[PDB]
Structure 1
Amino acid sequence: EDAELLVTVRGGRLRGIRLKTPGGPVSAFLGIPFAEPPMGPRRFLPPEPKQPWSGVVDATTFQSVCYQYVDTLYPGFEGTEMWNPNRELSEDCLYLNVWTPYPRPTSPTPVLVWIYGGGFYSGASSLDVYDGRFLVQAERTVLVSMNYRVGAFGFLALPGSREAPGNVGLLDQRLALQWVQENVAAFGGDPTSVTLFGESAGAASVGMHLLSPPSRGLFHRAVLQSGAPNGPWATVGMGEARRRATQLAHLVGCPNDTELVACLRTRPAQVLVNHEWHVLPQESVFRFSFVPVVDGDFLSDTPEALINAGDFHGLQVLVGVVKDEGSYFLVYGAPGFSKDNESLISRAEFLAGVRVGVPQVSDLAAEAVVLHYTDWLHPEDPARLREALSDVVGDHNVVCPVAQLAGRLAAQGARVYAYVFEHRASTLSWPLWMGVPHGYEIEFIFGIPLDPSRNYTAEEKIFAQRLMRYWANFARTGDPNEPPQWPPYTAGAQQYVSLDLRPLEVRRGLRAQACAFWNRFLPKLLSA
């Protein structure tokens, strides 16, 4: 009985497992229960803490994936399959993982907490690209990840009601963050040095914890990759949340909030999932049915207001985006797009696509978009049109929300570092025209190129090791540098770095001209 694989936490005793990495062994505690299974009558309710247990819980493999739609756009393709669940679906899914050095460290060690993305409708901590064994081995940190409910089960809200309050997925995350504060020390973690980091909806989740005081006490630093809580897809208002919930209920046969939620609780999980995408009000891309709701509780105002009003002195933040944020959403709905051709669209398709990528704005707003992103010397060139639609979708949903957050937090007391990830992985299976798509820096942060079974180049393994060092240096010290430098981002100089095989290169302005349009002008237009 290895005692480096035996830990007791407040609930009971845990048996873990030691994993092999190229560089040595790692202790892994996979599938620790942190909540009572949110099933039956607990479907849609806030998570209740895991009641204590006798004996030893075997924490030796990932537990189930929370119920979620499974992508079938290109069945069998690696590019879509790598994000689909790799454990059975179940509503019993509230488990977290801890990776730690072998042997368990003696000094308290800074802790990285990972929150997966997936548009709040999908994702799991068990995906291969989120394997924490390489970061832990390479940088002597403690790594935690948790599952949280998604789709209807985590974010359906009948706001005001007690049976479907909404935001329960975020409360799953918050409960895991409390587990880390009362139990990470048993693994050698330091509960006073905790860095949240996430990507896409994970990055938006990280942001909502910054802006939610009950969560703000549970961590000290933040990394937001390719996402932000002020993005147009990350939240929904109380009214539109209730409309979507009510339409979901009508669609699956349900009729008073109590009666309605009680009826939903009797539907097979798979039945809800099968109608998830039907409650969306407009034909769209980068829009998800059940996302966090702004109801005055978890978020006391909208993220845009809270960001603008916040005092962030004492916070360090690391934020960034990939080079082609938008391309990957287009093959999911934009007319004329396929992974299987060059997707050289017509001007008529471009205009149709702008309505899909910028859904539910006015006809005037749509015109202002076409103005800014047309080239009026080459208004019909299909290459220019395909890259402009890609930039509309990426700027509107990721780059400009992220840029607004970074600028505000710098101006209001936080230290901010910013990056653009510019390396297209050699093993990438999406077509060349998509550039560096959404989500494909994650494997490099987690060190997956160091996997022997993975066929990466030796330079990519060097690059992976650079990025883990930046991330672990940030988690340890609040600054990705160690004694070319990486300058802080500020609202004036707007400095960021490029991450690729070349050494760090400083640049200025995260698509500044474009983002003036989305963050300054377009709001004013919608207000009149």
Structure 2
Amino acid sequence: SELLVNTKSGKVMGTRVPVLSSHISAFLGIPFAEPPVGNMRFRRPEPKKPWSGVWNASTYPNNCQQYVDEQFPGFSGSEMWNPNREMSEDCLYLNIWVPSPRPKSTTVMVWIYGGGFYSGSSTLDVYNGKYLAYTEEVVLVSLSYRVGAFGFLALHGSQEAPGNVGLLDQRMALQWVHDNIQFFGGDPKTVTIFGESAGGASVGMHILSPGSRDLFRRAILQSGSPNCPWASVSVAEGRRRAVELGRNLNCNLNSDEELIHCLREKKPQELIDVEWNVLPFDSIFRFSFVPVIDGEFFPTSLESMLNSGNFKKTQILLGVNKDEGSFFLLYGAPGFSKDSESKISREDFMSGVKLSVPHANDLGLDAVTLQYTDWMDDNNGIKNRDGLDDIVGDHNVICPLMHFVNKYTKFGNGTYLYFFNHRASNLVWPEWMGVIHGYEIEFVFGLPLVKELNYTAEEEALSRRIMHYWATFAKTGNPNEPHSQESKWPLFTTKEQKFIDLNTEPMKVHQRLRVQMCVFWNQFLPKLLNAT
């Protein structure tokens, strides 16, 4: 039977699913770990114990316990990112989409969801792997991992809550793919890990961590990189936030054991209710429980690792969206609203800068303000709004990714860089938000090929081109079809620094993505803040 697969962990039964007039197999909600529940809360995951009988893999699994966005109830723009399944601490599952007929040894793509390490779901409509698996003849896996304090509470020195366990969940899922994907007709020697935002940071974290490098072949990073300022904290900061969480829940704070024990008695939602209280600053684009630079998962600082070449050397494909910062300003910056054009006053700009660069002294804040203010026109509400948008996306996504691409490319074996600047014609978010953080995903997953979703012809065409770039990259380490009349996506080189735009127009090659702004963020501002 096509829907029956015998893995090393036991047999699984899938389901035949329709996709664009054909069908493929789906194996949804396969367990890869023991449920991280009870005394296991905050612990390293354990391998799932093999089961007798047949695992029903016909339906999506629970989503991990997480903060739920209620900022716009019934709005599809925000709700499409929320858990669409029951939340449970029992959430360590993966989903596999397999072409029909079952292949023998096909390219494998493993999706890691974003969500700022505090949210995310593998089961989202926009993460449905059927279009990609079917169109490009890949075995498509989506994994899952603990988020929030559940995945990232970090008390370094303690073995009950060491930190990073969400990353270890991801690694356990990659391990299980490596070990079992062959039975689903995937080639475990040609696995691409790909992810957006926290999932992109995650991808680069597996590239860095010695314990993960051997479990995949190549990597794709969308709108995130391991060195993002929001993606990790020191072991002291992680400890400080863990204790603060404890303080919020009236815990005994005398010892790690007393603290962890107390936090283990609480219901998931009690943790979630106070999670945002532990942030050290008034900030946007900062999340409470994130990866911790521990000396185990990451042996030394991310920067010394990137500088020394202490990471997996392979091919990478990565890039960013035009307007990375708009979501975060909509949600926390004064003067931004969903149903207005959000023209930003001088005062609100100033407040925005403070929220955007929370670790900055006044001199630092003045440097940012000057760098992004048109002083011929400093009261232009559109310029202030767009300047803030750029500040947030440059600082949090684009310039760290550009620092990563530049460090990586010196030691790696091939880099492809994109700039995604097409705004979906059917976006429900306002125009001021532009090409929004996360709105390339639907194109990567092939949603524009579904007529009932109302994209344009040109959007379907763009989607098919991106799916084919991603899948050919995963197959060969090169997004370009060898021997093909199509415009070619050039390698990114240390010297020439080329990238392409990804949009509905004919391909254009550019050099030095946002170089002016990224010299500021990666070289000048850090030196300023260190010296003052």
Q: TM-score, normalised by structure 2?
A: 0.97
Aligned to 1:86: 84
Q: Which amino acid aligns with 2:227?
A: N
Determine if contact 2:321/2:436 at 8 Å carries over to the other structure: yes
Verify: 1:306 aligned to 2:312, yes or no: no
Segments of 4+ moved more than 6 angstroms: none
Q: Which amino acid aligns with 1:144?
A: V
Determine if contact 2:13/2:57 at 8 Å carries over to the other structure: yes
Counterpart-to-counterpart distance in 1, 2:391 and 2:2: 51
Determine if contact 1:10/1:183 at 8 Å carries over to the other structure: yes
Counterpart-to-counterpart distance in 1, 2:393 and 2:312: 30
Correspondence 1:247-262 to 2 at 5 A: 247-255=244-252, 256-262=255-261
Correspondence 1:99-498 to 2 at 5 A: 99-106=97-104, 108-255=105-252, 256-310=255-309, 314-482=313-481, 483=483, 484-498=487-501
Verify: 1:26 aligned to 2:29, yes or no: no
The CA deviation at 1:362 is 1.4
Query: SS at 1:299's partner residue?
Result: coil
Q: Which amino acid aligns with 1:245?
A: A
Aligned mate of 1:73, from 66, 71, 84: 71
The CA deviation at 1:361 is 1.6
Q: Which amino acid aligns with 1:296?
A: G
Q: Which amino acid aligns with 1:333?
A: G
Determine if contact 2:458/2:504 at 8 Å carries over to the other structure: yes
Query: SS at 2:367's partner residue?
Result: helix
Q: Which amino acid aligns with 2:169?
A: D
Counterpart-to-counterpart distance in 1, 2:312 and 2:46: 33
Determine if contact 1:313/1:414 at 8 Å carries over to the other structure: no
Verify: 1:502 aligned to 2:499, yes or no: no
The CA deviation at 1:451 is 2.3
Counterpart-to-counterpart distance in 2, 1:393 and 1:382: 17
Structure 2 unaligned blocks of 5 or more: none
TM-superposition CA deviations, 1:193-224 (whole Å, max 9, x none): 11110000000000000000110000111100
Determine if contact 2:94/2:141 at 8 Å carries over to the other structure: yes
Q: CA RMSD in A?
A: 1.0
The CA deviation at 1:305 is 2.3
Determine if contact 2:207/2:312 at 8 Å carries over to the other structure: no
Query: SS at 2:246's partner residue?
Result: helix
Q: How many residues align?
A: 525
Determine if contact 1:112/1:197 at 8 Å carries over to the other structure: yes
The CA deviation at 1:491 is 2.6
Determine if contact 1:486/1:497 at 8 Å carries over to the other structure: yes
Verify: 1:519 aligned to 2:522, yes or no: yes
TM-superposition CA deviations, 1:347-389 (whole Å, max 9, x none): 1110111000111221111111111111121122111111101
Counterpart-to-counterpart distance in 2, 1:414 and 1:398: 23
The CA deviation at 1:43 is 0.4
TM-superposition CA deviations, 1:287-307 (whole Å, max 9, x none): 000000001011112222211
Compared CA separation, residues 313 and 300, structure 1 to 2 (3 A): closer
Counterpart-to-counterpart distance in 2, 1:109 and 1:174: 21
Q: Which amino acid aligns with 1:524?
A: K
Q: Which amino acid aligns with 2:523?
A: R
Aligned to 1:41: 39
Determine if contact 2:207/2:311 at 8 Å carries over to the other structure: no
Counterpart-to-counterpart distance in 2, 1:470 and 1:434: 26
Query: SS at 1:332's partner residue?
Result: helix
The CA deviation at 1:413 is 3.3
Query: SS at 2:240's partner residue?
Result: helix
TM-superposition CA deviations, 1:72-105 (whole Å, max 9, x none): 1111111111100000010000001111111101
Determine if contact 2:313/2:411 at 8 Å carries over to the other structure: no
Q: Which amino acid aligns with 1:466?
A: R
Counterpart-to-counterpart distance in 2, 1:280 and 1:221: 34
Compared CA separation, residues 311 and 43, structure 1 to 2 (3 A): closer
Determine if contact 1:23/1:138 at 8 Å carries over to the other structure: no
Determine if contact 1:311/1:413 at 8 Å carries over to the other structure: no
Determine if contact 2:209/2:311 at 8 Å carries over to the other structure: no
The CA deviation at 1:313 is 7.9
Query: SS at 2:318's partner residue?
Result: strand
Query: SS at 2:467's partner residue?
Result: helix
Determine if contact 1:200/1:227 at 8 Å carries over to the other structure: yes
Q: Which amino acid aligns with 2:5?
A: V
Correspondence 1:54-73 to 2 at 5 A: 54-73=52-71
Structure 1 unaligned blocks of 5 or more: none
Counterpart-to-counterpart distance in 2, 1:32 and 1:119: 24
Counterpart-to-counterpart distance in 2, 1:229 and 1:276: 22
The CA deviation at 1:23 is 4.5
